[PDB]
Symmetry: C4
Subunit: 370 residues, 4 copies
C-alpha cells in the first residue's frame, strides 16, 4: 500500500535543451521514482560515457551545399515517420505522470512516430490505445521462463495492434543501481497488460522482481522461437558487441537495436555510441538498426545515422517532458528534437535523412576535456 | 533603453581573456551575452580555446633574431601585423560609437576592417571612422538577385576591395543564452533592411538569418565574383572539400572559421581543422583563419599551420565596450606586441618565418 | 588505541562507501595508516582509474544461467576467484584483529594470507580459521636462522604457500603517516625477534628498515628449498621480474604495487598486468592486486591474465565496521557482484571470465 | 622590502607544501615574482604534469642496499645528481639572499649557480660558499668588452664554468608581475632589464664565449634538439635543458617532455643538465633515465630559504637526497649510473589517467 503522487498537469513547455529538463523534473516527481528514472548502474560512469561519447566524433559544418527546407521524414519497416526517432520502451511512465504510458503514446502519435509499449507498462492497454488513437506501436517483451506465458503475451501484443516485437535481452539479471538501493525504492504499480498471463516464477511479478522472474538462460533458439510464433518483425535489443548482431540475424531477427539500457544494466562498459560503428559494419545493411542510450540533441541523431543507424530511440528526455507537462510536455520534447535535427541538417548540408547517413565525422582523439 | 557604454579611453591589456568579465560590467546583460555566448552548452567554444594546446611552440636559442617584423601583405594590402578585423554584427551592442569606432581603431592601427552586412552603422558612418583605410565587405545574401547586386554595388562604391561570403549561417546556431534572454536587436541594420520585413529592431537573429538566402550553392560564389569584379573570400570553412569547392567556383581566398562557435554545435575546435584545409588549398589562394584567437602565440600557431592572416573578433569588441576606438586600439596594440614577443622567442624575424615554424605535438590535450 | 569492537553484518551497496564509514569508527592515526598511500596518492588514484581503460561488453542470448564463481589455485578449491591479501596489524581496524578476518575468510571459503607483521600470533589466527587454508607472507629477517625459524613456525601452523613480499625493502613516502607521526599501538609477535624490542611505538620506516634490504634471487631459491612450499613473489610490476622470479624457483607471481603504498609516480597496477601475463605464459599462476573494488574489476583482471585477485582495503574497512561479520559481508558482496557481471557478460564459469573480449578506451577516465 | 630573516631547519614532507608556507612570510610582490609564470601558467602546470607521462617501475630482488647518490660532473664531485639553478634576487626570498643559498649548497656538497642578476656581490656569495664550487650564469650584454669584463670577474672569483642563458632575449608574459606592477627593491652589483642585454644572440656568440673565456660553456634554455646540435658545433661543453621554470615562452611543452629528443640528439657528446619542475626524487630519477646527467633545483630551494634561511634551503637539499635514495632502493639502482639505465612505463593517458 504505497502512496505515489505523480504530477498530473498537462501543458506545453519551452525546451531550450533536454539536459535542463532533468533538474526541472526533479522538482515535481517524488524523490524515489525520479531517481529510479534518472539513475544508472554503479558510479553512473557509463551513463556519463553514453553522454560524452558524442564528443568523440564531431560534425563538420558544410557550405554552399544547395540545401533548403530539410526533410526529416523517413521509413522503417514500412512505417512512414516524421523524423528518424522513435519512443524507446520503458515500463515506468507512471512515475513521471498520472496519465502514465497513455500520455506518452498520445504525444508520440500526435507527433507522427512509433510508440514502443513495454508489455509491463503500468497503464492498461485501453488507456494506452486511446492515447495512440490508431498510431503505430511496437511491443517490448522480456523472455519468460514459461513458454505458454511467452505465446500468450506475444498473441496479446498482436491483438493490441503491434507491428513489431522488441526482445530486450541485456537484462537477464538487474544492473547494480545504487540510487534505487540507497533510496530503498519500491515500484508501486502493477502490469495490467500481461497480469492475466503470468505463470510459474512470474506469478505475483512486478517491476520490482522482473529481472529474476524472467528468463536468465536466453539463447539464439529463443529469438527464432519468438519470430516463428509471432510472425511479426523481431528486434533484438541491448546489443553492444558486433558478434551478437551476427547471431541475432542468423537467428531470424528482423532488426538490431543497439543499446546499453540507458546505462541501467552492465557497469564499467563502453558508452553505447562508441559501440555502434563496429556493429553497423558487421550488420552490412542486412537489417535495420535502431540505436539508443544517450541521445539528447539533434546533433546526436545526426551522429548516430552517420555512424550506421537507421533510426534512434528516445527515453529519459521524453519522460522528463512528461513529468513537466503530461502528453503536451512530452510532445514539446519531440517537437524539440525535430527542430533541433532540421537545423543540424541545414548546417551540415543534408537535404534528407539518407543524406545524414553519409556525413563525414571529425575524429576527436582528445575526448571531452579536449 | 539600450544603454551601451560611451566612454573612450585606452585600456591596460594584460591579456584578452580578462576583458570578457570587464565588459560584462559595462555592457547591458542582453547584448553582452549575445557577444559572449555560443551554441549549446558552449563546448565547441571551449574546444576553440583548448585546440591551441594541441600544438605547442618551441623556444629557439641563438637564432640571430632582433626587432621582429610583424608587417605583412594580403591581396595587395600592406598591413602592420598578420591579423585583420573579423566581420561582426551590430557593434552598437558594445559601444555607442558603433562600427565607426571599431573602424577608427582598425584604420589607425593599420589593418583591414571587415564590414558585416548586419552592421548597425551605414557605409557612410563607417567610412568616416576609416578615413580612407582599407575595408572588405562581408555579405549575408538576400534571396532576391537584384538586392545582392545592389548591396555589392554599394559596398564597392564605398571602397571595399574584397567581398566575404559567409556561408555557415544559412540558419542560426542554437545559442541558449539568447533564447533564455529572449534577445532581440535594439536598433536596425541599414545595409540589409531591404529584405527584412521591418528594420531588424525588435527582431531575432533566427528570423534575420531566416530572411537571408538558405539555398547557397557554388553558383553564388561564381556570380558574386563575376558581378563585383573583386576577390571573394568564402567564410566558415571547416571541411577541406569546401575549400576545393570554393576555389573551383572562383573564390580568391579561404576563410577558415566556425563563426566563433556560434553556429554548428558538437563540431571540432576551429584550429584543429586548419592543417587539413591548408593542405587541400595547396597555396592556390590566401587563407584567413579565425575562431578562438586570444594571444600572440595563437597568431603564430595559426600561420605555422597554413594560415596567412588571422581575424580577431570577441577581444576587439570587448576592447570597444571598455574604451571605444581607443579601447579597441588597445587590443590591436596588445596583439601586435604579444606577437612581437613570440616572434623573438621562437626565432622568427618576419611573418614568413612564422609560417615555417616547427610545432610540438601534444597528444595529452588540455589537462596534460 | 581504541579500535571498534562491534560485530554485525553490513550492507554493501558498493565498497567505496566503506572507506568514509570506517572513518567514523576507526581512530584517526590508524584509519589513515590504512586509507593512505605514497606522495599525493596519484598512483592510488591510478590503481582505481586503470579499470576504465578496458571496458566490459554486455552479451546477449549467451545460454547462461546460475554462473559458477568457484575455482582452484594450487591445491585449494575456493568459492570465488579472490583471496585475502596479506595486511599488517588488523587490530588497527577492529579489536578482533587478524582472528576476525581469518573467521570471515574461512567461513566464506577462500584462502587467508597472514602477514609477517600481524598483531596476532599463529595461535590466535589458527583459531579464527578453524582448519581453513592459509598462506604465509614473509618480510625477511636479515638473519638466515631467523628466516628458517619463521618459515618453520608458519609451515607448522598449516601454511601451504609462502609469499615473499619484495617491494618494501624501504618504506614508501606515505605523507599521511609522516604528518600524523604514526607508530603501531601494539606489538608484532611473529617478527619480534628481529626488531630489537617490540613493534609497539615503532614506525613502519624502522620496522621495514629492520627487515632485509638486499633481497636477491638467491632468497627466492632458498625460501623454496627450505620450505618445500610453493613460493609467490609479491610486488611485481615489470615483466622482467616475473622471468627472474620463475627462474629462481617461484611457483607463483603476485602482481601488486602494494595498494600504491610504495613506489610513487608509478603506473596503476592493472595497466602492468597484460605485459606480465604475456611474459609468464601461464608457467605459474598469477595473483593480481591493487585497486579491486567491484566484481567488474575481478572479471577484467582475470580477462587480462590473472588467475585470482587479492582483496585488501575493502575487507579491512568491512572488518572495522562489523568484525568478522562485516568482513564476511564484503566477501559476500564481491561474490554476488561477480555473479551478476558473469551473467551480463555471458560467462558460465571462471575460465570463461579469462577469455573475455575487452573494449579499449584510449580516452581514459574523463572519456 | 621586508624579507624574512629567521634561520632554522625546516622539515619537508614534500616540496609542494613549501609554496603556500613561504607565501605567508614573503612580501606579496616578491613572492609572486618567484612563484609565478607566463600567461595563465598552463606551461608551469605542464612542467609538473609531464612527470606523469613516464612512470617508474618498482623492481624486486635487485640485490641493492644503501644506494649511492654521489656523482661527478666536469670533474666536480657532488653528493647527489643535482645542482642549484641560477636564480636572480634571492633577497626577495630572504634577507641573507644569495650568501644563504650559497652556504646551504656548499655544506650539502653540490655546485652553486651564480646568476648575473644576483643582489649580492661575488664577495658576499664567496663568504657563503666557503671554498665550495661555483658556475657563473651570464646574460650577454650588447658590448663585447662588458661581457669579457664580467667573465674575467667571474673567473677570478673561481667560476669553473659559464652558463649562457639564451632563452630570454625578451621577457615572458608574466601576468602576476604586470598586475602587481612589480619592481625590484634592490640592485645588481655584478651587472627593461632584459632589453639591455643582447637580443641578437647568434651561434657566433656561443663560439666566441667558448673560445675566449677558457671556461666550459653551458647553453641554457634548450627545448629543441636542433639547438643542442647547434650549440655543440659552436663549442658548448654542456647542454642545459630548461624552459626557465615556465617564465619565458607560453604555450610551449612541459620541459620534461622535451628531454628525450634532445639527449638522443646530443648522443653523449657533452653533459646534460635538466631543469624546470623537479619537485620529487622520482623526478630526478626520471630525468636521469631520460638522458640527463644532473638536474638543477630552483623554486623549492628558494621557498626553503624563505622559510629558514641557509638552514631552510639545506633541509630542501637534504629532502631531495633522502627522496632519491628511497627511489633508488625501490627501482633497483645501486648507484647514479644505474638510474640512467631505468626503463620507464609509457602513460598515454596523462594526468587524469
Ligand atoms: C527509467 C527507465 C526504465 C527503462 N525500462 C525499460 C523497459 O522496461 N524495457 C526496455 O526494453 N528498456 C527499458 N529502458 C531502457 C530504454 O528502453 C532505453 O534503452 C534508454 O532509455 C535509453 O537511454 P536514455 O533514456 O538515457 O537515452 C529503461 C530506461 C529508463 C531510463
Ligand atoms: C558578436 C559577434 C557577432 C558576429 N557577427 C558576424 C557577422 O555579422 N558576420 C560574420 O561573417 N561573422 C560574424 N561573427 C563571426 C566572426 O566573424 C568571427 O568568425 C568570430 O568572431 C571569431 O571568433 P572569436 O571572436 O571567438 O575569436 C560574429 C561573431 C561575434 C562574436
Ligand atoms: C593496511 C595495509 C597493510 C598492508 N600490509 C602489508 C603486509 O604486511 N604485507 C604485504 O605483503 N602487503 C601489505 N599490504 C598490501 C596488500 O597486500 C595489497 O597489495 C594491497 O592492499 C592491495 O591494494 P588495495 O587494498 O588498494 O586493493 C598492506 C596494505 C594495506 C592497505
Ligand atoms: C625566481 C626565479 C628567477 C629566475 N632567474 C633566472 C636567472 O636569473 N637566470 C637564469 O638562467 N634562470 C633564471 N631562472 C630559471 C631557473 O634557472 C630555472 O630554470 C628554474 O627555476 C627551474 O624551474 P623550477 O624552479 O620551477 O623547477 C629563474 C627562476 C626563478 C623561479
Ligand atoms: Zn673569437
Amino acid at each position: 500500500d504505497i502512496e505515489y503522487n505523480a504530477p498530473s498537469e498537462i501543458k506545453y513547455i519551452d525546451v531550450v535543451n533536454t539536459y535542463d529538463l532533468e533538474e526541472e523534473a526533479s522538482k515535481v516527481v517524488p524523490h524515489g521514482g525520479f531517481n529510479y528514472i534518472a539513475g544508472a548502474s554503479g558510479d553512473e560512469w557509463t551513463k556519463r560515457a553514453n553522454d560524452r561519447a558524442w564528443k568523440h566524433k564531431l560534425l563538420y559544418p558544410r557550405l554552399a551545399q544547395d540545401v533548403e527546407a530539410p526533410d526529416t521524414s523517413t521509413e522503417i519497416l514500412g512505417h512512414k515517420i516524421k523524423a528518424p526517432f522513435i519512443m524507446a520502451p520503458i515500463a515506468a511512465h507512471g512515475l513521471a505522470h498520472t496519465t502514465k504510458e497513455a500520455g506518452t503514446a498520445r504525444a508520440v502519435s500526435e507527433f507522427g512516430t512509433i510508440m514502443s509499449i513495454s508489455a509491463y507498462s503500468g497503464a492498461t492497454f485501453e488507456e494506452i490505445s486511446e492515447g495512440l488513437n490508431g498510431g503505430p506501436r511496437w511491443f517490448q517483451i522480456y523472455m519468460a521462463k514459461d513458454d505458454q506465458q511467452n505465446r500468450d503475451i506475444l498473441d496479446e501484443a498482436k491483438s493490441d495492434g503491434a507491428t513489431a516485437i522488441i526482445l530486450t535481452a541485456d537484462s537477464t539479471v538487474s544492473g547494480n543501481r545504487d540510487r534505487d538501493v540507497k533510496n530503498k525504492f519500491v515500484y508501486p504499480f502493477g502490469m495490467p497488460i500481461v497480469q492475466r498471463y503470468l505463470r510459474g516464477t512470474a506469478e505475483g511479478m512486478s517491476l520490482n522482481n522482473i529481472y529474476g522472474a524472467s528468463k536468465q538462460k536466453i539463447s539464439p533458439r529463443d529469438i527464432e522461437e519468438i519470430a516463428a510464433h509471432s510472425g511479426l518483425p523481431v528486434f533484438v535489443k541491448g546489443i553492444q558487441h558486433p558478434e551478437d548482431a551476427d547471431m541475432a540475424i542468423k537467428a531470424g531477427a528482423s532488426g538490431i537495436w543497439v543499446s546499453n539500457h540507458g546505462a541501467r544494466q552492465l557497469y564499467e562498459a563502453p558508452g553505447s555510441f562508441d559501440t555502434l560503428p563496429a556493429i553497423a559494419e558487421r550488420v552490412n545493411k542486412r537489417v535495420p538498426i535502431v540505436f539508443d542510450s544517450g541521445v539528447r540533441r539533434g546533433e546526436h541523431v545526426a551522429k548516430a545515422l552517420a555512424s550506421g543507424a537507421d533510426v534512434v530511440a528516445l527515453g529519459r528526455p521524453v519522460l522528463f517532458g512528461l513529468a513537466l507537462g503530461g502528453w503536451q510536455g512530452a510532445y514539446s520534447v519531440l517537437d524539440y528534437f525535430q527542430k533541433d535535427l532540421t537545423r543540424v541538417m541545414q548546417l551540415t548540408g543534408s537535404q534528407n535523412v539518407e543524406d545524414l547517413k553519409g556525413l563525414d565525422l571529425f575524429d576527436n582523439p582528445y575526448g571531452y576535456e579536449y
